[PDB]
């Protein structure tokens, strides 16, 4: 509706018998392949991304936002737990970091 791509803003310009909209949109570029999984199996629990997606660069698993590659460590703050690992098709085994774990550990 407001340009090709994800719309950010628009600017109106007057024209003879008309209006010209300069649509400022966000277009994704320089995409890269990653191995993806629906959920992460940790401690017999299934973890799902709260706002992102699980990606793998080959050896390590991360969670990133869907529209830009920004890999972050899979923690309990960006994932939520629902059910065990027996139901989700394609769940992979990976660790889920706990921010509270170094605090009681030290």
Ligand X SMILES: *[C@@H]1O[C@H](CO)[C@@H](O[C@@H]2O[C@H](CO)[C@@H](O)[C@H](O)[C@H]2NC(C)=O)[C@H](O)[C@H]1NC(C)=O
Ligand Y SMILES: *[C@@H]1O[C@H](CO)[C@@H](O)[C@H](O)[C@H]1NC(C)=O
CB nearer ligand Y, residue 19 or residue 89 = 89
Residue 35 binds to other proteins (criterion: CB under 8 A)? yes
Q: What is the 3-state secondary structure (H, E, C) of 57-103?
A: CCCCEEEECCCCCCCEECECCCEEECCCCCCCCCCEECCCECCCHHH
Residues of the chain with a following break (C to N over 2.5 Å): none
Minimum distance between the CB of residue 37 and ligand Y, rounded to whole angstroms? Answer: 9
Residue 86 binds to ligand Y (criterion: CB under 6 A)? no
Total binding residues toward other proteins, as defined by CB under 8 A: 46
**Residue of the chain from 90, 102, 105, 106 that contacts ligand Y (CB under 6 A):** 90
Report whether 25 contacts 4 (CB < 8 A).
yes
CA distance 15 to 82: 55
**Residue of the chain from 83, 95, 99, 101 that contacts other proteins (CB under 8 A):** 83
Q: Which does 104 bind (CB under 5 to 8 A by kind): other proteins, ligand Y, ligand X, none?
A: none
């Amino acid at each position: 509706f407001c340009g090709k791509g994800y719309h950010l803003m628009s600017f109106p310009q007057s024209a003879p018998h008309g209006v010209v909209f300069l649509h400022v949109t966000y277009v994704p570029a320089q995409e890269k392949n990653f191995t993806t999984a629906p959920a992460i199996c940790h401690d017999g629990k299934a973890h799902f991304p709260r706002e992102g997606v699980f990606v793998s660069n080959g050896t390590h698993w991360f969670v990133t936002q869907r529209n830009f590659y920004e890999p972050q460590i899979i923690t309990t703050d960006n994932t939520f737990v629902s059910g065990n690992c027996d139901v989700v098709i394609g769940i992979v085994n990976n660790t889920v970091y706990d921010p509270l774990q170094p605090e009681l550990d030290s």
